């Protein structure tokens, strides 16, 4: 019925930075003053920092600033903290005749800089207790590290995969500020046994780890 | 303390209709407009509709179909109701007088809403640790094939917290959730050390334990 479209999706900057998030109506309500700013930590309620464009909650520290401008609202934190890395959405309140309608934004997930990190990384085979079920999961951990964004390939005999595999990443890590990823490789258990060599390689700019193991020797 | 309370959470099954209910201790119910929002697993949040401190309720596009907000000021309740529930309904439901425009803005806890069309314990099978690690070594458990969500998996009976990685489920083709849980601890603890992840299953009330030995 209508969009607060946020932006950026995500974004990341070090503490004391100045952080700006916008948030658009898509049509145009000319002037819309029960818009607010909302704040979502990791497993917890939204909590409320921004009413009314502006007004700033009593307990919510100042360095959060809401501004105005008719359809696009603006929250702003001066100086940022350490408890300020959270999802932030924005919502409004339209209403014409036969309809009422609250809007939340997409969200912006405020992540925190820091020094680039090279995952542990490490190979799992299958155990034995799953093969007699059929299946075969080869899973592959990469270990605290920054930034997020890493190729994870699976190689079977020296053969690129694809299509069997899902990845799964966590939060960044609330003390040294890195993720952890895990890829897991499904095979039957029929072609985890004609094959020898599995391999995991992890492409992070210019370096590459491949971490294998040969099906039955340690 | 905690002034507004959702409940009535719990399982439905596909078609069935969940019926939330908030409740308000420590004043009324009457005097202000209360809205309901849900958030799916790693979604946004999402409006369904509120009620008015007067008595008309206004809904979304999809909720409209779906969706009725009623009160109660006798039990200081209003109840959301929906109905032909689906996989995209499972969420986190919330009431809240959202404040948008207002001082006044209070929210709930929230309440799971699970839509399932099976119940299936999960398997779990070791992460055996490394035997190529006086270093730092990788062992874990893998916890597929079980429906619905959540799994809660913790190490040793909480005992071992630090360096724990429980990741996020992901779906399977198979329509089945896998998730895994790792933990890095000390090479020269392998033969010393127990280690046992304890997966549950509330759903299926299964608690699965699983050693993760060397080799």
């Known amino acids: 019925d209508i969009q607060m479209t946020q932006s950026p999706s995500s974004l990341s900057a070090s503490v004391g930075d100045r952080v700006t998030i916008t948030c658009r109506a898509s049509?145009?309500?000319?002037?819309?003053?029960?818009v607010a700013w909302y704040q979502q930590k990791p497993g917890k309620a939204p909590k409320r920092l921004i009413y009314?464009?502006?007004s700033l909650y009593s307990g919510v520290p100042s360095r959060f600033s809401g501004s105005g401008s008719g359809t696009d609202f603006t929250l702003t934190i001066s100086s940022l903290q350490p408890e300020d890395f959270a999802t932030y959405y924005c919502?409004?309140?339209?209403?014409?005749?036969?309809?009422?309608?609250?809007?939340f934004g997409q969200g912006t997930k405020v992540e925190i800089k820091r020094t680039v990190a090279a995952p542990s990384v490490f190979i799992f085979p299958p155990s034995d207790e799953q093969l007699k079920s059929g299946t075969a999961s080869v899973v592959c951990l990469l270990n605290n590290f920054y930034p997020r964004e890493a190729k994870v390939s699976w190689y079977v005999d020296n053969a690129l995969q694809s299509g069997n595999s899902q990845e799964s990443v966590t939060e960044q890590d609330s003390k040294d500020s890195t993720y952890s990823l895990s890829s897991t490789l499904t095979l039957s258990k029929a072609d985890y046994e004609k094959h020898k060599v599995y391999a995991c390689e992890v492409t992070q700019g210019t370096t590459s780890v491949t971490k294998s193991f040969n099906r039955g020797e340690c | 303390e905690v002034q507004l309370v959702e409940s009535g959470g719990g399982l439905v099954q596909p078609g069935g209709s969940l019926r939330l209910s908030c409740t308000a201790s420590?004043?009324?119910?009457?005097?202000?407009?209360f809205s309901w929002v849900r958030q799916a697993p790693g979604k946004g949040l999402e409006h369904i509709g509120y009620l008015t401190a007067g008595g008309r309720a206004f809904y979304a596009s999809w909720a409209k179909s779906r969706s009725t907000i009623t009160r109660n000021t006798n039990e200081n309740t209003v109840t959301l109701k929906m109905n032909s529930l689906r996989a995209e309904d499972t969420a986190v439901y919330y009431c809240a007088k959202l404040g948008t425009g207002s001082r006044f803005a209070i929210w709930g806890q929230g309440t799971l809403v699970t839509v399932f069309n099976q119940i299936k314990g999960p398997s779990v099978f070791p992460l055996a640790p490394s035997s190529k690690s006086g270093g730092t070594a990788a062992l874990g458990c893998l916890v597929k094939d079980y429906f619905p969500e959540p799994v809660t998996v913790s190490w040793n009976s909480g005992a071992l917290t630090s360096g724990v990685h429980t990741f996020p489920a992901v779906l399977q083709s198979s329509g089945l959730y896998s998730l895994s849980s790792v933990v890095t601890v000390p090479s020269s603890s392998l033969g010393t050390q127990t280690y046992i992840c304890n997966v549950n299953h509330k759903p299926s009330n299964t608690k699965v334990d699983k050693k993760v030995e060397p080799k």
């Open positions: 049509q145009s309500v000319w002037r819309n003053k029960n």
């Open positions: 919502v409004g309140h339209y209403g014409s005749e036969n309809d009422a309608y609250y809007a």
């Open positions: 009314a464009i502006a």
């Open positions: 420590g004043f009324s119910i009457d005097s202000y407009g």
